[model samples]
Target: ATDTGGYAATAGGNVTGAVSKTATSMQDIVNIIDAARLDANGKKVKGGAYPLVITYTGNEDSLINAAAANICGQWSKDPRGVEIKEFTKGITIIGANGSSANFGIWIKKSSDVVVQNMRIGYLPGGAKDGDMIRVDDSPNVWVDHNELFAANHECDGTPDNDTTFESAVDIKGASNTVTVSYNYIHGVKKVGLDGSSSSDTGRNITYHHNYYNDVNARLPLQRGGLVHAYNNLYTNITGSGLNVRQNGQALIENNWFEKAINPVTSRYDGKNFGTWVLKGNNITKPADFSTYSITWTADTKPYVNADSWTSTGTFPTVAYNYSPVSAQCVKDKLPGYAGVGKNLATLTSTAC
Candidate 1:
């Protein structure tokens, strides 16, 4: 039914054609990533347009650094946060070549955004660099079909050099309802960190079917967040994998861990605190849970000896009904089709 009480046409009302957007440089992409509802006069615009299909023009670089040095308008918050209507129609920012480029975008305080089929991060240098993509205090974000790795170091084939990269993807600052799937996250020192600090209550973040290859630690270091990590292929993990600590709770299930140095670990972060609901994981090397036991001490006194331990207890349930693939089949099927430009999308769709 139309607004003027016009007769319904066919099965649905007449649809208006979509206007596709064209972005050539980094700033053009950033403008849409910081998509807001506003006018030239600084007045709020109502119900902004949909299908912001910002297709890349060419090999354009955002030219933004990481952490302290990274300066840009779209690095953090959007300008139109004052408006009551959020950009709910969503935006799809895709790479044009279906190949790669050098644009690392920081996504914070934005929602309903999709960043896919892209390459993000820096070249070989030391001293812990910035994250390829940072999602902070945002929700409903999907980072898929992308290659996340340090540009210089080729740890995938053979390591000719030594490099220390920071997080490939960081979901922090109470960021909720995020899914990091089908991406190649590797060559970095620390892969990812879900909750930044003890105060951050980042919850319901899902990481599944991602190839966590040849990264050192933090795949990711979950703290004060409820995380669901499953079916992610972990390869050449020289340090601890899936380090859940500092009141961080995780349901680690059915993930394939190959050549992982420490695989799974939980220890004191100033004070011992970690809870892991484990199930059906296939690790090539065995992980020792005994080394993770710690005595809870407060006020210079032992409060409780062995307050935390890793075990498969109750079947951890989530708002989204998810089932893990068998550990046996993860190795065979995961590497073939996880990460950018792959057919596998959903959790159930990728399962064995």
Candidate 2:
């Protein structure tokens, strides 16, 4: 169906018959998914070949970093590797690996993709310092039903040296429509959802129903749309909880927090302003994580104050305790999209 002169198909796993000659590196397998279109059910779609499903059923249930790098490195090269522009429908990576890798997965410029049902964890004996998943300049992505374990050797009888790591997911400049759901994550200490660089923009992001067990990850510079974050359990995470900036609106609801440092922190970047609706959440002290401290350095004035605290009267705790003008003036102060009420979310847990 590819009128674009039938793309070359590569194979990272076992391939026979028509795909025999085409199967090349892991990138080829990834490229197949990148080129072929498939429905959520994993069935090949018609009219166009997209969403090449690259399956890795290795003994460890993961791909070698070198092997995985082959794909990424290829992507960084000319035409095929650099800037995958032709395909628009997107790609799907089926990490059929039964084991986890110390490093994470990397994808760029690819859009409308999904990674599903894998025991995607980091290896203990391997070197640390990378997110479980790294994405940049991609949109309409989905990372679901994956188990994200921080590269912890102690707990799993692996090397304790590689235990500490950076982040689970790193959303670099200008990425959007990312859906993270139903992932069991543990042992991440830095900023979980991070977006660096001024050009990094995100939209329609959702982090729902994930179990964060022992994360010290901080939220990153916020820039995007309709971030639906809630229905998650935070076991051990601390610091300023939900730090969002430049989002037009966020839906924070139905999440449970225990013993977290600071629930929510926001720097007001004066724009049209997004609505932070905090609703139906539960927060307990000394029970969430071990107990950490969170400090807010705001450059601008807070949108909500005791004098002007107006709402549906549904939230009584949604009031500003410190005056922004009196505090350190954070130039671009953006309000928390959901409501910044009594129930703020967590830290000290891992990122998934």
Candidate 3:
């Protein structure tokens, strides 16, 4: 909190043992961030480690909207703030009454950050696929052991909660060298991790060891190039796993798919160079999973092929085989994505 330089004011309701000083506006958060770059290492930019880990344990169902906005909005707007440290062990961020605060963790202009062991949810207005822990335009980030809940998903939302709203975790923009692993993104309407559509520059993204419960549409598009998706479990997906929006080199391997209406697909989106490597994935059918509700006659096609890739050029090499991975997906870190776990591994231009 030293970076704040006494800029934040009191919100009146004493947060019992919380950071008595809170960021009142986006500019206040920016001011505190600018001060953190304390002329270290004899360089104008503070490149080395500033090293600060914030431990927030808010009340079970207390003031979460303002808290979440203060925490993340500060990190996202700052241009020089690089390394954020936080602990999300026993914090619960619940909005007033029950409204979805556009996003949970919206970060920007950061790198080498991580978010772990957090739980973020309870948006009564219904959610969207924009990622509860969204890392927009940042890089070298990681998202792990987080639980994004729509727990009472059926009770809220004006249209009723039968429809799953959006991706529990969404990473977008030009992100590279990122990893999303061991998280539970369930009760989602669209996809789990939406890594598509961007400022047009992305590379080396990997997703593994996560479990999707009732994922309607999985990761459908690889907007940039070189996306590696594998070892995840997708159960009860309405459509295929991918749209592959344009053409890029993708690696899909060791994934267990069951009760999925369509598994793979391609598109006619004008851009060329679409290819994939379907390697050794444990694709199978489940007995109890829902299949009768899904119709297999959709129009768009996601492909499941080891050969015959068509485009202006070719895709990456395809290695087909099923391997066993015994690692269990992790639990949610209360609210520290920009600090240590998933946020840091997801490489974006901003939001480190």
Candidate 4:
């Protein structure tokens, strides 16, 4: 049904007379988009001459492994990513079976886009925003059914002694409404970001049915606006998770948090911190913390935490329609549904 399952209501490029193209390489995708920018008359269009669906049939897993083998060299060199800029005609990039990409996808200044069923890993140039998938100034986007990963450990001698690897997904700018669903993300220090900076805020984002494991932090550091996180499985959170900052409001519910430290927290800012409405999660109060293997820690500085397991603050009414399964069901069945190679399978209440 193309139900992005959140505030974003997009069908990708499923429109009348939409072009269908198959890409065997990154350059092929770039050329396809450039070629579709105009019509038979060779004039520019606002979104594009027509909608497009690109089936990426390339495989670059070996290239990704080689680059990740020498992460330091990657940081010292230039960054590489495919930028989908201002191609608003609506596009969907779906990976076929046994397909993968070594590079990253950066969607900017576009709308109504979807990237699904892809295994993207270990990109070079981690120093400067070499994220696996970055959405900037793009609204109505759905990132679903992808596997994004890198080394969870930071490399030595990197910029500022950090940035060993980049984020899996980083959303910023006026890219208002987006939904990230059914993805398996692991082996990364910074998972994702909701807003870029303090001033860069406001947007409605939904993260559901996602399975995160062996990650360091950020399960999306929200700077401002609203986030609905539900029916997800989080495990092996070494540092923290769901850091809501800069007055961002989040609705955290019905999610399984196992062996996670600070599952839902607002920190890093001494003041003007955010708030979260907690409900139906595995951990309800401090008494249930140890039962679910949840732990807490101090940030050395002042910050807000969900130690109480109660609603820390209020969230606005959700504008989308979704039926989230129980936390126990999610914990039991999320791994099978989140990520690629399972034919884009989804977890609903019936299956759970």
Pick the lDDT winner.
4
Find the candidate with the highest TM-score and give its number. Answer: 4
Candidate 1 lDDT over 1-352, as tens digits, reads 1111111011110123323566666666657534544455666555444445566654523332442132222223221111112444555566665444444556666565566667554522223333567777766667776777653232332222333344577887746667777788866666777777766654667777788777777877877667778878887776567766666677777887666655665543656556667677663222322232211223232122112334623334566645667766766777766665664354454555
Candidate 2 lDDT tens digits, 266-316: 444554333456555553322323332223234456532111111112312
lDDT for 94 in candidate 2 is: 53
Ranking by lDDT: 4, 1, 2, 3
Clash number for each model: 2, 62, 65, 1
Candidate order by TM-score, highest to lowest?
4, 1, 3, 2
RMSD of each: 9.9, 13.9, 12.2, 1.3
Q: What is the lDDT of residue 250 in candidate 4?
A: 93
* Candidate 3, position 81, lDDT: 17
lDDT of 1: 0.56
lDDT of 2 at 209: 55
TM accuracy, model 4: 0.97
TM-score of each: 0.70, 0.55, 0.56, 0.97
Give candidate 3's error at residue 9 in angstroms.
Answer: 37
Error of 1 at 199 (Å): 2.0
Candidate 1 global TM-score: 0.70
